[PDB]
Design an enzyme around this catalytic site. Structure first.
Site, PDB file in Angstrom:
ATOM      1  N   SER A 159       1.148  -1.262  -0.002  1.00 49.50           N
ATOM      2  CA  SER A 159       0.564   0.063   0.027  1.00 49.50           C
ATOM      3  C   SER A 159       1.097   1.529   0.232  1.00 49.50           C
ATOM      4  O   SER A 159       2.301   0.867   0.468  1.00 49.50           O
ATOM      5  CB  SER A 159      -1.256   0.024   1.449  1.00 49.50           C
ATOM      6  OG  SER A 159      -0.330   1.157   1.851  1.00 49.50           O
ATOM      7  N   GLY A 161       2.343   3.452  -2.176  1.00 50.72           N
ATOM      8  CA  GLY A 161       3.271   3.091  -3.170  1.00 50.72           C
ATOM      9  C   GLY A 161       4.787   1.928  -2.687  1.00 50.72           C
ATOM     10  O   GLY A 161       5.522   1.872  -3.560  1.00 50.72           O
ATOM     11  N   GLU A 264     -11.669   2.870  -6.239  1.00 46.49           N
ATOM     12  CA  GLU A 264     -10.304   3.692  -7.113  1.00 46.49           C
ATOM     13  C   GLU A 264     -10.596   3.449  -8.636  1.00 46.49           C
ATOM     14  O   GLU A 264     -10.587   2.069  -8.952  1.00 46.49           O
ATOM     15  CB  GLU A 264      -8.900   3.274  -6.380  1.00 46.49           C
ATOM     16  CG  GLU A 264      -8.452   3.698  -5.204  1.00 46.49           C
ATOM     17  CD  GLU A 264      -7.416   3.800  -5.100  1.00 46.49           C
ATOM     18  OE1 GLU A 264      -6.766   3.865  -3.864  1.00 46.49           O
ATOM     19  OE2 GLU A 264      -6.125   3.425  -5.638  1.00 46.49           O
ATOM     20  N   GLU A 276      -8.510  -0.177  -7.705  1.00 37.48           N
ATOM     21  CA  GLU A 276      -8.202  -0.965  -6.128  1.00 37.48           C
ATOM     22  C   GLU A 276      -9.551  -0.621  -5.713  1.00 37.48           C
ATOM     23  O   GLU A 276     -10.644   0.802  -6.086  1.00 37.48           O
ATOM     24  CB  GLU A 276      -7.674  -1.519  -5.835  1.00 37.48           C
ATOM     25  CG  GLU A 276      -6.478   0.376  -5.558  1.00 37.48           C
ATOM     26  CD  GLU A 276      -6.257   0.111  -4.536  1.00 37.48           C
ATOM     27  OE1 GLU A 276      -4.911   1.281  -4.326  1.00 37.48           O
ATOM     28  OE2 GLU A 276      -5.306  -0.785  -3.641  1.00 37.48           O
ATOM     29  N   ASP A 283      -7.985   7.038   2.109  1.00 35.97           N
ATOM     30  CA  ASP A 283      -7.239   8.465   2.373  1.00 35.97           C
ATOM     31  C   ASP A 283      -7.894   9.587   1.338  1.00 35.97           C
ATOM     32  O   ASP A 283      -8.190  10.907   2.772  1.00 35.97           O
ATOM     33  CB  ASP A 283      -5.846   8.390   2.542  1.00 35.97           C
ATOM     34  CG  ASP A 283      -5.673   8.072   1.522  1.00 35.97           C
ATOM     35  OD1 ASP A 283      -5.486   7.660   0.091  1.00 35.97           O
ATOM     36  OD2 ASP A 283      -4.092   7.930   1.637  1.00 35.97           O
ATOM     37  N   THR A 284      -8.210   9.727   0.962  1.00 31.26           N
ATOM     38  CA  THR A 284      -8.221  11.186  -0.523  1.00 31.26           C
ATOM     39  C   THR A 284      -9.665  11.526   0.140  1.00 31.26           C
ATOM     40  O   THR A 284     -10.475  12.834  -0.375  1.00 31.26           O
ATOM     41  CB  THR A 284      -8.674  10.375  -2.138  1.00 31.26           C
ATOM     42  OG1 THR A 284      -9.388   9.549  -2.078  1.00 31.26           O
ATOM     43  CG2 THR A 284      -7.310  10.089  -2.129  1.00 31.26           C
ATOM     44  N   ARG A 360       2.192  11.437   6.982  1.00 33.32           N
ATOM     45  CA  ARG A 360       1.313  12.614   6.967  1.00 33.32           C
ATOM     46  C   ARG A 360       0.796  12.473   8.678  1.00 33.32           C
ATOM     47  O   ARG A 360       0.191  12.000   8.967  1.00 33.32           O
ATOM     48  CB  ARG A 360       0.454  11.388   6.197  1.00 33.32           C
ATOM     49  CG  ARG A 360      -1.177  12.684   5.450  1.00 33.32           C
ATOM     50  CD  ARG A 360      -2.469  11.665   5.538  1.00 33.32           C
ATOM     51  NE  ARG A 360      -2.222  11.422   4.683  1.00 33.32           N
ATOM     52  CZ  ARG A 360      -2.602   9.139   4.184  1.00 33.32           C
ATOM     53  NH1 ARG A 360      -3.142   9.157   4.904  1.00 33.32           N
ATOM     54  NH2 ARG A 360      -2.695   9.446   3.059  1.00 33.32           N
TER      55      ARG A 360
HETATM   56  N1  LIG Z   1      -2.119   0.947 -14.021  1.00 33.33           N
HETATM   57  C1  LIG Z   1      -1.701   1.726 -13.636  1.00 33.33           C
HETATM   58  N2  LIG Z   1      -2.032   2.769 -14.599  1.00 33.33           N
HETATM   59  C2  LIG Z   1      -2.020   4.392 -14.022  1.00 33.33           C
HETATM   60  N3  LIG Z   1      -1.760   4.623 -12.737  1.00 33.33           N
HETATM   61  C3  LIG Z   1      -1.389   3.337 -12.404  1.00 33.33           C
HETATM   62  C4  LIG Z   1      -1.815   2.256 -12.395  1.00 33.33           C
HETATM   63  N4  LIG Z   1      -1.547   1.489 -10.964  1.00 33.33           N
HETATM   64  C5  LIG Z   1      -1.652   2.026 -10.499  1.00 33.33           C
HETATM   65  N5  LIG Z   1      -1.715   3.898 -10.602  1.00 33.33           N
HETATM   66  C6  LIG Z   1      -1.468   5.086 -10.007  1.00 33.33           C
HETATM   67  O1  LIG Z   1       0.211   4.759  -9.437  1.00 33.33           O
HETATM   68  C7  LIG Z   1      -1.014   4.480  -8.192  1.00 33.33           C
HETATM   69  C8  LIG Z   1      -0.433   4.283  -6.870  1.00 33.33           C
HETATM   70  O2  LIG Z   1      -1.184   3.472  -7.300  1.00 33.33           O
HETATM   71  P1  LIG Z   1      -1.942   2.006  -6.683  1.00 33.33           P
HETATM   72  O3  LIG Z   1      -2.234   0.678  -6.995  1.00 33.33           O
HETATM   73  O4  LIG Z   1      -3.654   2.559  -5.434  1.00 33.33           O
HETATM   74  O5  LIG Z   1      -0.900   1.662  -5.781  1.00 33.33           O
HETATM   75  P2  LIG Z   1      -1.398   1.533  -3.414  1.00 33.33           P
HETATM   76  O6  LIG Z   1       0.346   0.873  -2.896  1.00 33.33           O
HETATM   77  O7  LIG Z   1      -1.716   0.409  -3.438  1.00 33.33           O
HETATM   78  N6  LIG Z   1      -1.312   2.339  -3.027  1.00 33.33           N
HETATM   79  P3  LIG Z   1      -2.946   3.149  -2.322  1.00 33.33           P
HETATM   80  O8  LIG Z   1      -3.746   3.614  -2.936  1.00 33.33           O
HETATM   81  O9  LIG Z   1      -1.974   3.925  -0.690  1.00 33.33           O
HETATM   82  O10 LIG Z   1      -3.349   1.585  -1.365  1.00 33.33           O
HETATM   83  C9  LIG Z   1      -2.677   5.447  -8.386  1.00 33.33           C
HETATM   84  O11 LIG Z   1      -3.137   6.052  -7.451  1.00 33.33           O
HETATM   85  C10 LIG Z   1      -2.581   5.790  -9.616  1.00 33.33           C
HETATM   86  O12 LIG Z   1      -1.735   7.282  -9.953  1.00 33.33           O
HETATM   87 MG   LIG Z   2      -3.226   5.709   0.233  1.00 33.54          MG
HETATM   88 MG   LIG Z   3      -3.477   0.046  -2.768  1.00 36.95          MG
HETATM   89 MG   LIG Z   4      -4.604   3.556  -4.179  1.00 38.85          MG
END
Ligand SMILES: Nc1ncnc2c1ncn2[C@@H]1O[C@H](COP(=O)(O)OP(=O)(O)NP(=O)(O)O)[C@@H](O)[C@H]1O
Ligand SMILES: [Mg+2]
Ligand SMILES: [Mg+2]
Ligand SMILES: [Mg+2]
Ligand SMILES: Nc1ncnc2c1ncn2[C@@H]1O[C@H](COP(=O)(O)OP(=O)(O)NP(=O)(O)O)[C@@H](O)[C@H]1O
Ligand SMILES: [Cl-]
Ligand SMILES: [Mg+2]
Ligand SMILES: [Mg+2]
Ligand code: NA
Ligand code: NA
EC number: 6.3.1.21
Lengths: 389, 389
Positions: A159, A161, A264, A276, A283-284, A360
């Site tokens: 999570s 990133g 998302e 996802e 958070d948003t 944060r």
């Molecule tokens: N396939 C994809 N194509 C384009 N942008 C993407 C893609 N996957 C993720 N992103 C971008 O990267 C961000 C983070 O991706 P995400 O899958 O939500 O990571 P995470 O680790 O699960 N973060 P979180 O939202 O905190 O759970 C997204 O909100 C987009 O800005």
């Molecule tokens: Mg987040």
């Molecule tokens: Mg996520």
């Molecule tokens: Mg996300």
């Protein structure tokens, strides 16, 4: 629906599994209804603990530890704030009669990208980016070759990133793999094709006794694994909103149970693509602390207690901006606060006991006549805060 | 303005003297900014204590007790919720450098009808009812005589209408003088001339760093010494409003210090009469939990912390309606809650440990297209809640 009085024998007890800033607002909303609150996390003095009747610090990933605290406190509801939890035990407990919010299965599916992605894309047939899973460096490479560039790799259990690489060429292959290995249970990764969207949103969807409700679309700006700003409403065509809602409804109902979910999505003109989902407040969605009559937190609480939502009021253009300092301290202070709040401008300071790098620590909130203006007002305020430690 | 982190060495500490429903919301607002909250009251598990960091049960009328708790906790702010406190100790402590909200002087003057009445009528030359102070039945007797019928008798150290008698006839006088003794300290009174107003309002006035700002006027219905319904905004003439603001400003500025003040006034046509004022958030102001961007509790905190207010947004016709049952119990439950919430409708349940007679256990909050519709909505929801013992 019957509610008791906190601390009395007939009390309604809620257990929070994760006591961060998101859980903190759920606690407040529970307390506003005289709901008894037990906050749990992996560290002491976590935000939600500040406003709970009692707190415990355990290994949330430890199923036995989980069972122990649950047996000890006998909550009516178990409300997870994060992905990193002993979802297998949640399932047991649920069967054992415990109300896991929104449901134990929702929690299992979403703690690993594999469960959620395959359900959405394969089972639900919802639109998503192309993807390939890989559990070895070699398989990792085969995935990339098939997926093509650019592509993004992410640990299946991550999570914010953590361990993610935006891959443009074979050159970064080595590092991308290592990095991803670094993130998680420290194994498996997802390789996703890059979606080029016009913009991204979080559609806050509420599944309640009286159906599925939607908050106005929330737009957000990411910066290296973290959301930086969010705003509402995010302008979208009628067609796109409808498809967005269709997707969100299907996902939430599939995941099952009552609560607020953070759907998302990626928007491409009139097209919508599923990314996802958080089976809880997002958070948003913190912008809803200023932009609606019922925050996403009030909404989650309302839904999970079995009460009808009825409807959601949006007050006009609004935004949030994180207060995300970078320092190492165990005695953080915030100066210049007189310049971070005012007309249509507020802040929230979470009470986090310490920081060691980027974390944060709060959020600035603002309303305006347009999202553009709100965003600037909110970014400005967050920036005015003088974080020292 | 520099804020520390709650529980940390540089934490900013707020001590609440009185932990009821009003204190409960101030506590929440402090928590939202990471401020450390110590909730004090004369009974355990008072509503504000549920959401505080820690609490103390003391006899707030005992100055020594007060000094001891204060000295122990070393708060940066001392915030009273009620009149019944050792205001003398407050004065002392302030002299010692403690920050009493809004100021110790303001507290003393208002806890005694004699101080505030004289300050407003005489010092500031404001319009009030006709009054007189009796200090012997004989004088009581003479006074009712000078005021005439009908008239109101009140202890000079009375609230929630405690020890008051609405006198239309001499017969009451035996009773009247005695009751003025039931309540209070258990022996001085005030005799006021009955004002025949069009309606009553509470003008929530915030005194802060950026000056004095007002909330839209709140009208309300009193019954048996307890407000039943409150609404906003109460329809008034521009002239009427202007005069009300003028009066509110002189008064708050005269009491001194930063905070939210509840200025009680009577309106007859374009004329405004000062009744009294609370140097803290006012019960009727609970409608602001749904009616404004900033609730009276958030305003109080913003002000006392030395931050600027800027502006107050009002979201249209809104109302509050109390949940005021009457029974004896130490384990109250609330049924049929699903019929007390919905679109534009919320409820609060305070967490009070017990009841033995008539007690305010919650409040219903509503918004509507008209003040009238808002009131019905709020009343109806409060009435749907089944309070079990
Ligand atoms: N396939 C994809 N194509 C384009 N942008 C993407 C893609 N996957 C993720 N992103 C971008 O990267 C961000 C983070 O991706 P995400 O899958 O939500 O990571 P995470 O680790 O699960 N973060 P979180 O939202 O905190 O759970 C997204 O909100 C987009 O800005
Ligand atoms: Mg987040
Ligand atoms: Mg996520
Ligand atoms: Mg996300
Ligand atoms: N002179 C008066 N003329 C007409 N109505 C009055 C007068 N004084 C009081 N009332 C009514 O009585 C209510 C209670 O009076 P008040 O002087 O505020 O007593 P209290 O014990 O100090 N109550 P509280 O508001 O909790 O401090 C007011 O809100 C009015 O509705
Ligand atoms: Cl695959
Ligand atoms: Mg009074
Ligand atoms: Mg009064
Ligand atoms: Na607490
Ligand atoms: Na559930």
């Amino acid at each position: 629906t019957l509610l008791g009085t906190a601390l009395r024998p007939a009390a309604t007890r809620v257990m929070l599994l994760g006591s961060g800033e998101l859980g903190k607002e759920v606690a407040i909303e529970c307390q506003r209804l005289g709901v008894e609150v037990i906050a749990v996390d992996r560290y002491a003095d976590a935000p939600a603990m500040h406003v709970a009747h009692r707190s415990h610090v355990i290994n949330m990933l430890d199923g036995d530890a989980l069972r122990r605290v649950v047996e000890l406190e006998k909550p009516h509801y178990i409300v997870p704030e994060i992905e990193a939890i002993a979802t297998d035990m949640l399932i047991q407990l649920e069967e054992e009669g415990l109300n896991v919010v929104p449901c134990a299965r929702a929690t299992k599916l979403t703690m690993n990208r594999e469960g959620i992605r395959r359900l959405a894309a394969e089972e639900l047939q919802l639109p998503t980016s192309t993807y390939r899973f890989a559990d070895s460096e070699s398989l990792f490479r085969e995935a990339v070759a098939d997926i093509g560039y650019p592509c993004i790799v992410k640990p299946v259990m991550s999570s914010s990133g953590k361990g993610q690489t935006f891959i443009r060429s074979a050159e970064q292959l080595a590092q991308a793999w290592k990095y991803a290995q670094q993130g998680g249970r420290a194994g498996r990764v997802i390789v996703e094709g890059v979606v080029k969207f016009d913009f991204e949103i979080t559609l806050l969807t509420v599944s309640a006794v009286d159906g599925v409700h939607f908050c106005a679309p929330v737009g957000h700006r990411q910066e290296d694994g973290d959301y930086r700003e969010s705003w509402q409403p995010q302008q979208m065509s009628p067609l796109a909103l409808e498809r967005a809602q269709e997707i969100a409804r299907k996902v939430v109902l599939a995941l099952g149970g009552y609560g607020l979910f953070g759907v998302e999505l990626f928007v491409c003109g009139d097209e919508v693509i599923f990314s996802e989902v958080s089976p809880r407040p997002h958070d948003t969605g913190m912008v809803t602390l200023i932009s609606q009559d019922l925050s996403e937190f009030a909404l989650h609480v309302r839904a999970f207690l079995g009460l009808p939502v009825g409807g959601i009021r949006q007050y006009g253009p609004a935004a949030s901006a994180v207060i995300l300092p970078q320092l190492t301290s165990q005695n953080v202070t915030f100066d210049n606060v007189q310049n971070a709040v005012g007309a249509d401008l507020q802040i929230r300071l979470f009470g986090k006991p310490e920081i060691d790098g980027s974390r944060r620590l709060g959020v600035a909130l603002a309303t305006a006549e347009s999202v553009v203006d709100a965003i600037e007002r909110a970014k400005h305020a967050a920036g005015q805060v003088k974080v020292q430690g």
